[PDB]
Design a protein around this ligand. Structure first.
Ligand SMILES: NC(=O)c1ccccn1
Ligand SMILES: NC(=O)c1ccccn1
Ligand SMILES: NC(=O)c1ccccn1
Length: 165
């Protein structure tokens, strides 16, 4: 079939900003893509809606997906607490790359990051599974609320999220 597309509706201190949409690479990382897809729809009873981008470093990346500790230490996959690195077929080529955050080999949960630069040192250690399709202007707006140490000057939230036709 066709690779799924997922959207995030982003808010800044509760104020609507815009929509970021993502192509998920189910054709190359079906397991990893399915996790992010189901967390986006909330169809297992948990996921990304209402959570925040807790760490944003301009010229590097926007990190989110921690809906259990809201700070980078939590989250869980649709398969259990953690799942294996599925493969490293896809590389971190530039801005818009969507990739899994982790704390060691085989520790993927729900946390993910959106690259805003090429981050080749992450290749072969973070599983890349998607890419921003629309709203890279919105990801760039988000990023302006980050800082050098990653603390956001405003609260950046996924006000709504879902799967698109
Ligand atoms: N430690 C992590 O999950 C990480 C996430 C994004 C970029 C670099 N490292
Ligand atoms: N990606 C995760 O589930 C994670 C990443 C860093 C620290 C703790 N958990
Ligand atoms: N490890 C690398 O290839 C690299 C490239 C630029 C900045 C930091 N690290």
């Amino acid at each position: 079939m066709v690779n799924p597309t997922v959207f995030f509706d982003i808010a800044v201190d509760g104020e609507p900003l815009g929509r970021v949409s993502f192509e998920l690479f189910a054709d190359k990382v079906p397991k990893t893509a399915e996790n992010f897809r189901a967390l986006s729809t909330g169809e297992k009873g948990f996921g990304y809606k209402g959570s925040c981008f807790h760490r944003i470093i301009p010229g590097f990346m926007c990190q989110g997906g921690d809906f259990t500790r809201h700070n980078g230490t939590g989250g869980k996959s649709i398969y259990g607490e953690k799942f294996e690195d599925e493969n490293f077929i896809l590389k971190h080529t530039g801005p818009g790359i969507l990739s899994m955050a982790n704390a060691g080999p085989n520790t993927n949960g729900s946390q993910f990051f959106i690259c805003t630069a090429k981050t080749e040192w992450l290749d072969g250690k973070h599983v890349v599974f998607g890419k921003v399709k629309e709203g890279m202007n919105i990801v760039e707006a988000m990023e302006r609320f980050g800082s050098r140490n990653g603390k956001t000057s405003k609260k950046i939230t996924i006000a709504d999220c879902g799967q698109l036709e």
